[model samples]
Target: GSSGSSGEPVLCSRTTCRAALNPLCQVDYRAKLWACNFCYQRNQFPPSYAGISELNQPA
Candidate 1:
């Protein structure tokens, strides 16, 4: 499939945390990077990204 579930976007593990993952899933992909929006974490890209474009969904 070209996508994953449009799962929860409004919850966090940290109680003090008040953020949500973007509905569009606009990932900030880089070499070994995917700057997360909500917390001090991020998503990893697919093995075939080749650094060509924005891989919105995590691999």
Candidate 2:
């Protein structure tokens, strides 16, 4: 809503990876999790992100 800026980008936790979350990354809506496409490591969504869908993606 705010031009999709100002907010910090979520990155992969692994030091070797650290890839930013993007549209290409895999998402598990039911689990509230996402997997980094670069390293294929699974990551949990922030507590604030209580719900999400494939169409309603994070910027």
Candidate 3:
């Protein structure tokens, strides 16, 4: 099973670690950004994700 089969997985920008967004990733709700667990690099959320929430965030 997956977090949401209907939703596409978001990925980190670091070329070496294109890790997909998951629960392990740290979320900065205030900044609307997410940090990749594997690369430990912060990434910005897509403009469409402006309204992302814990329940609807990409996993």
RMSD of each: 8.0, 4.6, 5.5
User: What would you estimate as the lDDT of candidate 2?
Assistant: 0.70
lDDT of each residue in 1-59, candidate 1, tens digit only? 25844333333345665444443434554456444455656555445543332234445
Q: Candidate 3: lDDT of 50?
A: 35
**Per-residue accuracy of model 2 over 1-59 as CA lDDT, tens digit each:** 35642345567889899986677888776787888888999888776442334234555
Clashing pairs in 2: none
Q: Give each model a TM-score.
A: 0.26, 0.63, 0.63
List runs of model 2 lying over 4 Å from the truth.
Answer: 1-6, 50-59
Predicted model with the maximum lDDT: 3
Tens digits of per-residue lDDT for model 3, 3-52: 54454456678989988667888888778887887889988878565333
Error of 2 at 19 (Å): 0.7
Cα lDDT of all candidates, in order?
0.46, 0.70, 0.71
Q: With candidate 2 superimposed using the best TM-score fit, by how many Å does residue 1's alpha carbon deviate from the native?
A: 8.3
Candidate 1 local Cα displacement, residue 48, angstroms: 4.8
